[PDB]
Amino acid sequence: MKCHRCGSDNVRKMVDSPVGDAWEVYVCEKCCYSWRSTENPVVMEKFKLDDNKIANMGVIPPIPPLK
């Protein structure tokens, strides 16, 4: 199983449905993308990610110096 947003295989199960075997939730852990086992997601090509885009992503808010 791969991640639908960045294509990494470092994806694991996050949680089970609290009631029964309804569904599961998976998380990427390389880009934090989560999705439910029921919904089959198709991330638009504009919203996909690689290691290069995550690098120059920009932080909010900025991290201050340490003193």
Binding site: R5, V27, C32, S34, E39, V43, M57, V59, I60
Partner: protein
Amino acid sequence: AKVYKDLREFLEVLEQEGQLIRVKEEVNPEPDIAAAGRAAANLGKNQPAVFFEKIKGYKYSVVTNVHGSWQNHALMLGLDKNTSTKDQFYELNRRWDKFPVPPNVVKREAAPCKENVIDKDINLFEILPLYRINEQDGGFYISKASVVTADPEYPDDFNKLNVGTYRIQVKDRDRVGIQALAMHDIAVQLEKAEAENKPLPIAITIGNNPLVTFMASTPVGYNQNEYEFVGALQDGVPMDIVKSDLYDHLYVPAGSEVVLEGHIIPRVRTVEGPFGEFPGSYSGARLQCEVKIDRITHRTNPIFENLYLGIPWTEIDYLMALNTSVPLYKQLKETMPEVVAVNAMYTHGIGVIISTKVRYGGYAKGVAFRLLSTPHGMPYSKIVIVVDEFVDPFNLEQVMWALTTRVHPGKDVSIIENCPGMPLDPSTNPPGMHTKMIIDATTPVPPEPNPRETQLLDPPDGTEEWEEKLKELLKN
């Protein structure tokens, strides 16, 4: 004016007034809770809150579009469900002046939010029916949430304790991501903590008194406590708060459905978003803070108060309609009594229309300067229109008249580069940074020269009486 101590009292009133419908059938969370929220706002007028009783995987229930109509907005203030927009605006203008109303601190045993405690293996999905709001969202989000943080430098100053609304992406069973935007109060406190590599204690409340949710999204000053404003909006009735379990200096509403006690991990950013926001577009993914959930307190059978947002005038646009205009009006009026009213309902104040008397030539531009130097209008307001005293800033028809007859683009339109901006505005080319535009749609006053005639026509003599005589003849 019936005042509510918890979200449940308000929901009960909403149903008695025909402003709440129950979805008794079980419904899987992914495409439906979002669709119901969009449809509810799409209803146009008298939009009700929808209550989901059963969700496919979860134990508890959810409510969307709680604030998503003027009817609900009026009942929030304890007024008649059909009270007009400006009637509510004037009611807020009055209760606002009762500002300091110290909250009532209660014992832990008296707080319903302390009924249940989770300190062992933490799981948000156990208690919150998490769902996806928009298709391309980066994950499951908690949109309507009142977040409590305290100033690390002055943790005892109750005034510097600030509660506000920030979007929260669930990233694990016990960790979430918060958008600490640079211009909001939380970023001031986070900078002080991160400057020492110290964590920032935080309390995320869910399902509260609608007035608490109201003040959360209100851009009041840093040194003003939002709990003290809630007591004013309740017409002097203080609200009930309790101390957090893990952190002193942190006080949460007593009637909250869910309280998440945790801390912001310092000097760390992770991939948050993307997320559909109020401009009707997806906001791109950025590196934003992460929060670790340390403990959960919640009422038995908790209620998940979440909202849908998207192409404008969803629930959120109703929430932000008046809580943005009132404080902007008060903040201007403190320095400038000539101001009559302020309209900031449009896309969260990115566009503002101000009605004012012109004390002396050019005074309209000065009012715009004050609006652009206010905690909310400095980073948010991009287009500021100023009209005369007698023009209703809420009547876009009249504003269109002022633009066509009182604006000389040679002088009355002013464009200023490289001013503070809001990144959620998809027009800012340097993101978070936009060029301001000020439009002086007021009639010139000395010493501004005016060779033309611009005074308005006094209606003919009997127009007042003829209005009645015409209405009378029509009754045949």
